[PDB]
Amino acid sequence: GPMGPTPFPTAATVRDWSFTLFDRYEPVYTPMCDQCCYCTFGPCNLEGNRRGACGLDMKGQAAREFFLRCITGCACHSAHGRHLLDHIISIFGEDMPINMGASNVIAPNIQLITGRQPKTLGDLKPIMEYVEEELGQLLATVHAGQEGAAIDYDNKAMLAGILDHVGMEVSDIAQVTALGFPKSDPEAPLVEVGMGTLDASKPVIIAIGHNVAGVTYIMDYMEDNNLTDKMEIGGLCCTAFDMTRYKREDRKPPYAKIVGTISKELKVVRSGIPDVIVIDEQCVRADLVEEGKKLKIPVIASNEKVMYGLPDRTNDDVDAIIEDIKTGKIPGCVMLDYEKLGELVPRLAMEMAPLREGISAIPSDEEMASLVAKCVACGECALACPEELDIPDAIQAAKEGDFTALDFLHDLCVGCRRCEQVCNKEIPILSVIDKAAQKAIAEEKGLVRAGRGQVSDAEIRAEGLNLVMGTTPGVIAIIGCANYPAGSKDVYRIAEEFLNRNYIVAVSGCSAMDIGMYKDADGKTLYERFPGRFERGNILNTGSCVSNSHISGTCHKVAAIFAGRNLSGNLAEIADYTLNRVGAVGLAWGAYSQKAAAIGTGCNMYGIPAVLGPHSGKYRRALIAKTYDENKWKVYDSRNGSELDIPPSPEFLITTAETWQEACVLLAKNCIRPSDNNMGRSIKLTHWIELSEKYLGVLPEDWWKFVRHEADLPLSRREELLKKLETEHGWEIDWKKKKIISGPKIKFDVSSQPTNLKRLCK
Amino acid sequence: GPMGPTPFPTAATVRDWSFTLFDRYEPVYTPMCDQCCYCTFGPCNLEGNRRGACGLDMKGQAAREFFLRCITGCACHSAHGRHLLDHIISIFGEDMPINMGASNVIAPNIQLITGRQPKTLGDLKPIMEYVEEELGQLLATVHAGQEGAAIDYDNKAMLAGILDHVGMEVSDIAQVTALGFPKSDPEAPLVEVGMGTLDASKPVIIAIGHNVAGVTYIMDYMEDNNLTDKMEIGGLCCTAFDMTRYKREDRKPPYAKIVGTISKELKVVRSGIPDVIVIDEQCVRADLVEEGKKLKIPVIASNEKVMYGLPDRTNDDVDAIIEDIKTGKIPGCVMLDYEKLGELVPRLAMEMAPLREGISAIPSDEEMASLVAKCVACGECALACPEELDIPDAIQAAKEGDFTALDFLHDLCVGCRRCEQVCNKEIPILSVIDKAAQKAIAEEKGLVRAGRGQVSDAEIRAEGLNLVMGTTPGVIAIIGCANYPAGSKDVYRIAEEFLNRNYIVAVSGCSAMDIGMYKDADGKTLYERFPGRFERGNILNTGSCVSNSHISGTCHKVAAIFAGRNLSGNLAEIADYTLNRVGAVGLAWGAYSQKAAAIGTGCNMYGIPAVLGPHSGKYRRALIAKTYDENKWKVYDSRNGSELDIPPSPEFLITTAETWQEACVLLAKNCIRPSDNNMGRSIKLTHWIELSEKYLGVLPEDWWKFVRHEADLPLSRREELLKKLETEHGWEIDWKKKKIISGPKIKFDVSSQPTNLKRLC
Amino acid sequence: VDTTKNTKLFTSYGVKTSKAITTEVAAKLISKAKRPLFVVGTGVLDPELLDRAVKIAKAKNIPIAATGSSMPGFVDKDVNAKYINLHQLGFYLTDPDWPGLDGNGNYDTIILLGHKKYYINQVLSAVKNFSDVKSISIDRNYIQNATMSFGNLSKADHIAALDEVIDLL
Amino acid sequence: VDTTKNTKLFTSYGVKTSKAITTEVAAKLISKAKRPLFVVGTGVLDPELLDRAVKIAKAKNIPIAATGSSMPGFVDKDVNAKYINLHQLGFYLTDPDWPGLDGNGNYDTIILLGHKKYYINQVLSAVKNFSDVKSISIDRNYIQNATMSFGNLSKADHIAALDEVIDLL
Ligand code: SF4
Ligand code: SF4
Ligand code: SF4
Ligand code: SF4
Ligand code: SF4
Numbered sequence A: 001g002p003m004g005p006t007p008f009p010t011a012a013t014v015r016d017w018s019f020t021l022f023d024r025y026e027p028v029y030t031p032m033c034d035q036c037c038y039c040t041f042g043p044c045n046l047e048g049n050r051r052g053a054c055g056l057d058m059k060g061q062a063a064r065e066f067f068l069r070c071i072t073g074c075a076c077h078s079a080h081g082r083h084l085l086d087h088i089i090s091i092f093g094e095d096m097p098i099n100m101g102a103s104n105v106i107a108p109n110i111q112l113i114t115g116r117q118p119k120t121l122g123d124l125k126p127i128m129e130y131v132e133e134e135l136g137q138l139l140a141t142v143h144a145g146q147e148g149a150a151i152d153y154d155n156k157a158m159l160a161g162i163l164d165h166v167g168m169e170v171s172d173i174a175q176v177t178a179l180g181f182p183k184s185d186p187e188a189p190l191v192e193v194g195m196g197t198l199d200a201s202k203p204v205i206i207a208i209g210h211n212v213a214g215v216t217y218i219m220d221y222m223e224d225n226n227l228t229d230k231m232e233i234g235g236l237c238c239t240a241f242d243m244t245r246y247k248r249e250d251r252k253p254p255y256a257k258i259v260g261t262i263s264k265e266l267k268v269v270r271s272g273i274p275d276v277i278v279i280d281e282q283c284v285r286a287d288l289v290e291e292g293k294k295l296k297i298p299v300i301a302s303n304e305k306v307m308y309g310l311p312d313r314t315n316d317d318v319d320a321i322i323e324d325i326k327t328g329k330i331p332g333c334v335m336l337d338y339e340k341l342g343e344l345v346p347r348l349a350m351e352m353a354p355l356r357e358g359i360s361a362i363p364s365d366e367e368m369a370s371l372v373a374k375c376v377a378c379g380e381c382a383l384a385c386p387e388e389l390d391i392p393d394a395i396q397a398a399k400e401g402d403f404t405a406l407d408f409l410h411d412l413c414v415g416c417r418r419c420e421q422v423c424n425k426e427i428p429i430l431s432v433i434d435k436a437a438q439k440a441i442a443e444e445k446g447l448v449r450a451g452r453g454q455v456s457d458a459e460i461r462a463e464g465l466n467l468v469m470g471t472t473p474g475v476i477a478i479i480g481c482a483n484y485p486a487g488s489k490d491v492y493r494i495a496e497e498f499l500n501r502n503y504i505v506a507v508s509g510c511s512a513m514d515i516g517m518y519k520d521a522d523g524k525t526l527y528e529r530f531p532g533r534f535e536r537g538n539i540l541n542t543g544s545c546v547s548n549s550h551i552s553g554t555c556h557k558v559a560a561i562f563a564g565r566n567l568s569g570n571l572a573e574i575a576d577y578t579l580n581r582v583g584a585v586g587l588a589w590g591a592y593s594q595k596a597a598a599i600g601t602g603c604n605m606y607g608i609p610a611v612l613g614p615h616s617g618k619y620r621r622a623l624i625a626k627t628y629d630e631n632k633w634k635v636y637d638s639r640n641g642s643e644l645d646i647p648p649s650p651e652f653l654i655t656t657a658e659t660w661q662e663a664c665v666l667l668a669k670n671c672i673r674p675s676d677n678n679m680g681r682s683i684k685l686t687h688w689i690e691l692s693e694k695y696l697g698v699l700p701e702d703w704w705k706f707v708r709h710e711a712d713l714p715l716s717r718r719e720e721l722l723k724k725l726e727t728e729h730g731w732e733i734d735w736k737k738k739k740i741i742s743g744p745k746i747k748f749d750v751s752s753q754p755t756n757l758k759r760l761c762k
Numbered sequence B: 001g002p003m004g005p006t007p008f009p010t011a012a013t014v015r016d017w018s019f020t021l022f023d024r025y026e027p028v029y030t031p032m033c034d035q036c037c038y039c040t041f042g043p044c045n046l047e048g049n050r051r052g053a054c055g056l057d058m059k060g061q062a063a064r065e066f067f068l069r070c071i072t073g074c075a076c077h078s079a080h081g082r083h084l085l086d087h088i089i090s091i092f093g094e095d096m097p098i099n100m101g102a103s104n105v106i107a108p109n110i111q112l113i114t115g116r117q118p119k120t121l122g123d124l125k126p127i128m129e130y131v132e133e134e135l136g137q138l139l140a141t142v143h144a145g146q147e148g149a150a151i152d153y154d155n156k157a158m159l160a161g162i163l164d165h166v167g168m169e170v171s172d173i174a175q176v177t178a179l180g181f182p183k184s185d186p187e188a189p190l191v192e193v194g195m196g197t198l199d200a201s202k203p204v205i206i207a208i209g210h211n212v213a214g215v216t217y218i219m220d221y222m223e224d225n226n227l228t229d230k231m232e233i234g235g236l237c238c239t240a241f242d243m244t245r246y247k248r249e250d251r252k253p254p255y256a257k258i259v260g261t262i263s264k265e266l267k268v269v270r271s272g273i274p275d276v277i278v279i280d281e282q283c284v285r286a287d288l289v290e291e292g293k294k295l296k297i298p299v300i301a302s303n304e305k306v307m308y309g310l311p312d313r314t315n316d317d318v319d320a321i322i323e324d325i326k327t328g329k330i331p332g333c334v335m336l337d338y339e340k341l342g343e344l345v346p347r348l349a350m351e352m353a354p355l356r357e358g359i360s361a362i363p364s365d366e367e368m369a370s371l372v373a374k375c376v377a378c379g380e381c382a383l384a385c386p387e388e389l390d391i392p393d394a395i396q397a398a399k400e401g402d403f404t405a406l407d408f409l410h411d412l413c414v415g416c417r418r419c420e421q422v423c424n425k426e427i428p429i430l431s432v433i434d435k436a437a438q439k440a441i442a443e444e445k446g447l448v449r450a451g452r453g454q455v456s457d458a459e460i461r462a463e464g465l466n467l468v469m470g471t472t473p474g475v476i477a478i479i480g481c482a483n484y485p486a487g488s489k490d491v492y493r494i495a496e497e498f499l500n501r502n503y504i505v506a507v508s509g510c511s512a513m514d515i516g517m518y519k520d521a522d523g524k525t526l527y528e529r530f531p532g533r534f535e536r537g538n539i540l541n542t543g544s545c546v547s548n549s550h551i552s553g554t555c556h557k558v559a560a561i562f563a564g565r566n567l568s569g570n571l572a573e574i575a576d577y578t579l580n581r582v583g584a585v586g587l588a589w590g591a592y593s594q595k596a597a598a599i600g601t602g603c604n605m606y607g608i609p610a611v612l613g614p615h616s617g618k619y620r621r622a623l624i625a626k627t628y629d630e631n632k633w634k635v636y637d638s639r640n641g642s643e644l645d646i647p648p649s650p651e652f653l654i655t656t657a658e659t660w661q662e663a664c665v666l667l668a669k670n671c672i673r674p675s676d677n678n679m680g681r682s683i684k685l686t687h688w689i690e691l692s693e694k695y696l697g698v699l700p701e702d703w704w705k706f707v708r709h710e711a712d713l714p715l716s717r718r719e720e721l722l723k724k725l726e727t728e729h730g731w732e733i734d735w736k737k738k739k740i741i742s743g744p745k746i747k748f749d750v751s752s753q754p755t756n757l758k759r760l761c
Numbered sequence C, D: 001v002d003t004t005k006n007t008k009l010f011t012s013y014g015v016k017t018s019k020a021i022t023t024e025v026a027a028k029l030i031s032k033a034k035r036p037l038f039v040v041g042t043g044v045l046d047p048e049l050l051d052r053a054v055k056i057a058k059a060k061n062i063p064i065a066a067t068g069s070s071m072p073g074f075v076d077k078d079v080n081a082k083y084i085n086l087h088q089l090g091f092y093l094t095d096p097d098w099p100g101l102d103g104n105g106n107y108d109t110i111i112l113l114g115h116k117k118y119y120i121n122q123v124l125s126a127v128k129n130f131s132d133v134k135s136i137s138i139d140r141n142y143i144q145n146a147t148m149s150f151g152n153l154s155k156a157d158h159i160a161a162l163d164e165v166i167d168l169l
């Protein structure tokens, strides 16, 4: 029916909104290099904001690099979605209706961007097509001499981010509708997570990747032959969530297990636990064969994206492949036929379990003593460590029978092996750390909730009242990868702190795995302490990486439920509404991948601020606003069209934080919105002040910038803060009524409607 | 009809063919950078083939970088094709029959790859769709942890290259069947090209880029308003060739002019000649706004890919935009409305011509005497020069009154002003060089034949015998950009030398317009001297590099029209035929862009070896064969299925050469195929030995490997070569009746058929 | 105690590199700063590092930007310290019009102590490429993107160097 | 003449840079080499560089590999110069099973002269990162990818350094 101005958008159509965002949130470029390696006219030295042979300055180069990362992430999501959709339509038919959950808008991102309302599975076919076409255009911008300004690369990156969100939504909708995933279930079944959950007394299959097509066939073969009680299947990365959501809408406990994030990927292979490894698409270490052939661990590729230089045995007989892998020259094969793979992997694991027994890279106690005695403290390993761990100090401590420093370093290490390749003594430091933390690994057991899907249109209404009556301080979306600066406990600490204050915490991806890994002193995890509903003090795990499209979609639904705004082709309107009214902040503590960059950029284009880990400064682009400049904090009143002041929150669209206390303070502060009433503003100020005092020893210096009314102040210390306002700031206050009569620079008016667009003013 | 075994190929469908190719031609990785910087786990130092935090080694990283370049070029060509097809369909509909000339295989690359034979302009719509899909499935591989083998990356890069030749094919097909281009015309009109071919007392419109979509509107506005004589329209890069070919099926000479390649861009801006500049999509300098604003040159962007951060004034009135630009309130504008742009550009040029008279960046003699004396010879400019020119020496010579050093430097300089940013004396070195070379810039005139399009069926049928048998010594496809190492005359010299030797020379892109800039004593270019039919001794121009596919398509026609092979879905068999029996070689002496890399990779998948300039060594991957291994030169027989030995030619699929003499020797040597008869091998050996003795100064050290019979040698030197074979290699040759009793390694057989596929024997 | 010895890196940001200075040069540069800003990180919470940082800041009355969660260390102390994000500080330092923490104007030279390499290097890239604010690194890691920096040092060597710099301020 | 004073570069491949060496060090390395190869490019057609290269080759009977168009400069010079493509030579030097130009085997160290900086650097990247062949660049430029290299010099200083090397061999 009614359509907005931007259906099927391009770089020109979303230029106005992106430019409006960049006028307030200026881009900050932190180049990862002083040179350009792109074309034979180079490499060009752009240091000091100089120009290349093509006239491109270093700011433009950084913008182009970030744009390339965003489009690579978008391409990954869209290609995974396209392959999943094609397989699903081939197997289940093109007329299958979309069954996502109890909702009014089943595809909020698709409706928001394209303007269409898909009903069946085939309705998703054109949308994917559009995305891929646009991808080509965007990819054409990576060519040399294809853009001169950095702002035009930032706008194209924003377009790439929103297209990425569309692709993730398409993929998740297809997979959930087809493979019987949980449909917005607040009581999703719990699944074990950790390296100490795989019983080494049974054959072990380990699936690494992000797809689920072949994993479903493997599980079907296991179930049909009743091998589920004697063979253990584990998942690394998002395929663990995808396999633990398979047919789990009935809440039956799943036999599949979750091993961990990318960090564990090599470590498990080092332990000899896996008996067969299958690799699907992405987040797969490019040296699994190198460290697996040493332990006689077969590695099987299953997708054309990743063939790992292996022989292609697709058109063959399973028995011959089994015999060659068992006693032969090939450490694996590429098996692109899904039925053949689902039949081959279980039999191969069964026949390899009794033959690879007693093989692991963990050194003996005497072997580890000799290894720790071999070091000379040359400092190369600490120089090559991505996390800058103090390896030589730990080795020096362990030289005298003190194996606890390596035990501490085990959690901080990411298992990247970069320290081993610079050691002239050939000391396997990763295996040394694993040997020192063997007992801790054996103790690693946790529980996580399976992917519920999207948030239903009933929980949003149930939580809107709590958000407007000042009982829900905001929404925190803990997502991203697992390249943490100081171990996997930081996400757990942040989630626990925000759940203790009755926030709405939504988790997905590797962060959910690394949060559900720390049991409490009572032997409980956060998912068991707090239910999986969309309500205050509750934590819900949406699912795999492609489930993040739901979280952003949730924001869109808030615009489409309480305000009644049209979603079809209304990117600018809904983005403005989310930026001005909805209090939701994303947190990507360990993001490394280009997919994380695409997700963060797409969230920024929807108006959702994000705080990332200290490593994310390597992404070369952030979006920060100048607090001091008062002329960049003005909007229009959608009733008068006049200029209206707003508090300086959110003060960034994407930023980085070093420690988790700083992240907690930033997340608490950035939940504030200009349109907040007295109760919401009061509760947000309360929590922000409390967190600042607890984690910084001081209370914020800009708190007074968020006090429009005497009801804006916290309840506990109202008089203590009013006295400070009168004394430190000189405001005029009445003491009998405890009322601020003068001093605020913005009079409270709940009916005011902030807008960044002049085209929607009376 | 009868369809081959690879319908709509993917990574796995062409994996076997790529592996077969790389079994003979190993990939040589020459990485440009010792670190990987893709994800935040890095920067990962990969020096010494060490693996990164994700397990990728340095060879894998180099392969990934080359694959990224290839897919970038392929996506650029495919996006150009998609935009052109959409815009053309929005005017002429979607049921317009395709007419590329007189032939039956209208789309060779499309039929070879997708097995489809489109006949209407809308029938190309699905093809692009397929390509777009594959593009995504390749770009996802750039993500960290999506592939861990350099060989698989190379296979995917070759697939991207072929999907880049398909995109170029569709682009050229649409733009030729719609806009009225020459239709395989062997008598295309001559076109004035050069710096001095443009006037200066008239308004000037300079079109930079690759999209002839707004240039068409400008040209119609100028022709229907009788402005073809009152102003000048010049073009740079391939948009010049496309603009010239526009509406030129009537063979009348065009009024549009060609200024030069990309290396001339800033130069033109610094000359003050242009009165307006319109930038479309590709090969556009990123600092035109700054220099144009310094020289008060309006800049208009008419595309979504290139916007420059200029205001979007598509919905604004033309008069208001013209007034704002004239009064200097904005440095330029963005206009996506072609109808508005075609009226705005000429009017803006006409109004701005009498407003910037006497405005230029060329220094006066006294200023070029002061700036030259300002230098203190610190050597930073020579360090920062991509072409490694002795700028301080030239400036020192200028301090003595001799300005010939800078005049000689002018041709070698690609005009990138990279020097001017490192000079602490703030000397406009490019401007100084242009001032010292003004006397030659004034003479920069020449003629180039416009793009013919494709090759007609009659020419292919006539030349198939001479090509497969070898009567024509070979085909040289001079393609690529203008990032030359030692000036733009090397390509002209190579083309002239090979045209004098009865070779077929096909040109396209910037090299086509750079060859015709040099004249002989009579003052005529190579295009005027030699005709433009697909015959020995003639030189033909295909135009823009989107027409480059035609050259590759030409080879496919030879494999299909003559031998009767089936094109549909038969990439492996056709590529095998071209590698085994067709004598063709490509030359990219100045390749710099990702499009050139994609084109080269696609050509290498088709079995066409390529020689590139030294700068192409920064492309991070070549394909070279081991000449000292006899196990890499074994094939099978199509009649018996038994092993067969072949001469080690070509010794590479892509490589680089330091100088143009070495390039000539390589092109001469790599045109020899195992299937040539005695006459073809004799002619090829004659040319190779003559070129080697003329340029390298010594007779080749492996010519005796390419001899199987007594008729395989040149007749004028047959006795001398018999003596040379007898005294050194100790062969048995009968002196009474000239015949080789014994000594060779491969025995002659006219009916022998070499194949690299065991499934075809 | 010689700091300009181990100028060793794992990866390089380009050709331009930091200067490895001695204790005397660092003391002279700190004492000659027109308007210094002691940018400190969460890694200064080590008691020796915290004491040395407080002594350095109070010796020359240098205002402190306690980036990260380093504010609780300075609450009990006397040095004028304010909290600010390191990324936000890097964005602000590239603006000549920034009033600063005191509102008296933008700063000239920033002293860095107690930071992670991959973070401070990323911020210093923008700071050193899009501004003219000088950076002096007195950390035990060799920072490439700083204008001047110490070399790779042991913890005892770093403590000794900081003590010598204190005695030479 | 001092050859280890100017090592300025425009760009850098990475942390591992070439060692700056003197004339005496280069002479000692060339004398100690067991099976050296003299890889000359088309830039040894200079009237002076050709004489220096011929003297160097005749001093130690080093076989010459001429790349590009330098072969005519050795047609009648009484040396052992043979033609080979530089890219092909760089690929073959990474294969230990190469018979070599002479026919005995591969080589241990190669001396570079008369090359273009970018081309020789790109060709040497593969040799440095994928083989164990040492590189001695005696050219006028500072090649980073070489094992040992002369620093940046003027033409007169380049000639003086080459003459000093010859007189010390
Ligand atoms: S960004 Fe990476 S690849 Fe590009 S020049 Fe810098 S180090 Fe090299
Ligand atoms: S793209 Fe531009 S900056 Fe990069 S290498 Fe090429 S000319 Fe230099
Ligand atoms: S690299 Fe090896 S020898 Fe050097 S400090 Fe580390 S563990 Fe010890
Ligand atoms: S494997 Fe662990 S300890 Fe070694 S460099 Fe990588 S993160 Fe550091
Ligand atoms: S992609 Fe791999 S090699 Fe490159 S920076 Fe990331 S972890 Fe390191």
Ligand code: SF4
Pocket (backbone or CB within 6 Å): B375, B376, B377, B378, B379, B380, B381, B382, B391, B392, B395, B422, B423, B424, B425, B426, B427, B429
């Ligand atoms: S950079 Fe400038 S001062 Fe230095 S040598 Fe070149 S022209 Fe002379």
Ligand code: SF4
Pocket (backbone or CB within 6 Å): B384, B385, B386, B387, B388, B389, B391, B412, B413, B414, B415, B416, B417, B418, B419, B420, B429, B430
């Ligand atoms: S403008 Fe010319 S002389 Fe200057 S650096 Fe570029 S190519 Fe060299």
